[PDB]
Design a protein around this ligand. Sequence first.
Ligand code: NI
Length: 341
Amino acid sequence: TCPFYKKIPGTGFTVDAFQYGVVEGCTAYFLTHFHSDHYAGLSKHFTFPVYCSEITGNLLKNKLHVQEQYIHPLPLDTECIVNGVKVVLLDANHCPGAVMILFYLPNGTVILHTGDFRADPSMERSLLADQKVHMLYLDTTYCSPEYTFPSQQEVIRFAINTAFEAVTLNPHALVVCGTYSIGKEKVFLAIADVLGSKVGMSQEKYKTLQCLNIPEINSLITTDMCSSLVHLLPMMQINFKGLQSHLKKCGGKYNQILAFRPTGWTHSNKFTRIADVIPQTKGNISIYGIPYSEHSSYLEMKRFVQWLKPQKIIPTVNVGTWKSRSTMEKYFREWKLEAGY
Ligand code: NI
């Protein structure tokens, strides 16, 4: 049944709750972003109101075929009334179209639901600075001190320098980047830009990217693989067997593959810096795992929460085990005692 951490008290609302059938008492279903564990259950047969960003609404219409009459897109950073309740959508710094949602309950309680987010100091100057938040529904994906990772900027700088050097040494090297969802577009776009190429991809992935309101996108992507030297493939294909196979398909246009796998976290983050990352190599194929994250590090999470000073925290990730729940509750108490709220 629908878990309590997906329900907004004092309202008829649910967040990211599309796989339980009809939730009794739900008058409006919000969707924070277009990732499959969050939209799981939506289709052209859905007949309840869905509230979301413009970009998420484009993907619902074009990829899932939800009918336009049930899609209610809202602008960001704007006070809106939904079924009698004031709400605001804020940028979550996750994937394209991802939002956090501020609910202003009739009784005076203010609730923030982060959806999935990568906390950032710039959030401390949004509409969040303007009033107190009592309850926080928090993306706790990486809520443990082992989880450090570099800035997105540092990671993109590494990828751009690595690719440019490789291709300039060998003009017959192909660059491949893995994907299985929206998000992390900066990785393949930044590499293609430094190489003066468009990125080539499947028709299904091209359709997906044309939903994202990315400026000048027609100048940056293409379905013509032959004219491109940065290819996107399914993340499943980013291994030696899949890459050797792909190389055969290019008809001797290329003699070397340099591939990127933008993982979340991996245990080499506890030891190694970004400047010191190395690939796995077999023959003329090299695979780089790069720690490009669209979720908060532990320290980024902690700074946001200690700034916001909520009265109550409700985790939305890692909630399935008692040992995980208890560990998270210990960190929350540490943070509150350190900061004095
Ligand atoms: Ni997500």
